[PDB]
Design a binder for these strands. Structure first.
Lengths: 183, 183
RNA sequence: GGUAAAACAGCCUGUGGGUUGAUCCCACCCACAGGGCCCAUUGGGCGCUAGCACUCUGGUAUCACGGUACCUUUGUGCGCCUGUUUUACC
């Protein structure tokens, strides 16, 4: 099928997992080594359920910009031998707009779901649930709950992580390369 | 988890797929190159639905032994550019008994299912549905339908393909290395 | 012109030489001469902000020592980008 789906299936097979925390079930994306990404509201504790099996969290960083502003991403280091495929090369320096994107989701509510979203525009400031948030990306698609964590993709590019919606629009936290230079 | 579970998950991720034919939904195992294996009761036609994608069948063989006896396996050559991981090294030259096995199934009825089976005994002749059949492997897990095609595994070894059950006992067709010297 | 197909180029510079759409900036080609970089080297390979898949040369972790995960190199199929052809179709 489309080159984006070929890209998207591979990304989900090699780098994604289903995660349960105290606050729900999420798609989770492994960046490299043992570092992965959840939406901030997942609030992962000392251990998580990764594909129905308990895994310890060695470290959890909640991203904010230079000013202290929410970015709606939590990076967590997983206590497991396996390393993720290194997809930092698929992350861009700064926010990415595309004319057509796929949002991929893998949870028990939404198993193997590859949603074509269309135009992704760089949105910037958003008031998520009372919290000033920055580096939002926006796309025009009727979103539901339980989609947070979904990986927004384009052929050869990982744009961000779905972090919320409003009924006709969905919003992803941009996933920037320098977030993972080290941590 | 088990060394066997690590093995089975790897096998399903890299080598299995869900297949629909005119005769139901099946777990399917890729052997190498583009050769795969199904139960004969799948009876694949000129195309199959492989992970919801139409795939053409270049060639299909229903296995018989030198004596002409049913083996309950269909080998099919898939018209795909991508090639399967070569797992012929995990196949034995003759039927294998193990004292501990996992049967792995991936259909919409049975998503991401890894059934611990226990002893696998070499059963030999079976009268499947009125057809003299040979090289049956027998294991005792009161089984249900839609499990045909499940992969019977132990760490480092692929024993066979689930082809039927009886309420108490389950049966796999043994998957021997010389079946694939050239296919 | 489109519109399909095919088919063949792509390391980077200059040195020519033409041609070129045209007489001007080009674009191509035709060649030469340098500089390279990679590999597993009598050799190979080097368009990839577009990737996917297997395979191969080595590593590193881990393991119930059967495997598993990742990195790295070799190749091959599919895809993609530029051209240059050729053929239809309108």
């Amino acid at each position: 099928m489309g080159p984006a789906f070929e890209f998207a299936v591979a990304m989900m097979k090699r780098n994604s997992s289903t995660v349960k925390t105290e606050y729900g079930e999420f798609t989770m994306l492994g960046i490299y080594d043992r570092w992965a990404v959840l939406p901030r509201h997942a609030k992962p504790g000392p251990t998580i359920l990764m594909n129905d099996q308990e895994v310890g969290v060695l470290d959890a960083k909640e991203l904010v910009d230079k000013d202290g502003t929410n970015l709606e991403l939590t990076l967590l280091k997983l206590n497991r031998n396996e390393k993720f495929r290194d997809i930092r090369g698929f992350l861009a320096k700064e926010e990415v707009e595309v004319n057509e994107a796929v949002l991929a989701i893998n949870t028990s509510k939404f198993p193997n779901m590859y949603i074509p979203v269309g135009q992704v525009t760089e949105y910037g400031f958003l008031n998520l649930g009372g919290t000033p948030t920055k580096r939002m990306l926006m796309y025009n698609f009727p979103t539901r709950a339980g989609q947070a964590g979904g990986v927004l993709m384009s052929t050869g590019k990982v744009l961000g992580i779905h972090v919320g919606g409003n009924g006709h629009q969905g919003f992803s936290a941009a996933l920037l390369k320098h977030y993972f230079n080290d941590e």
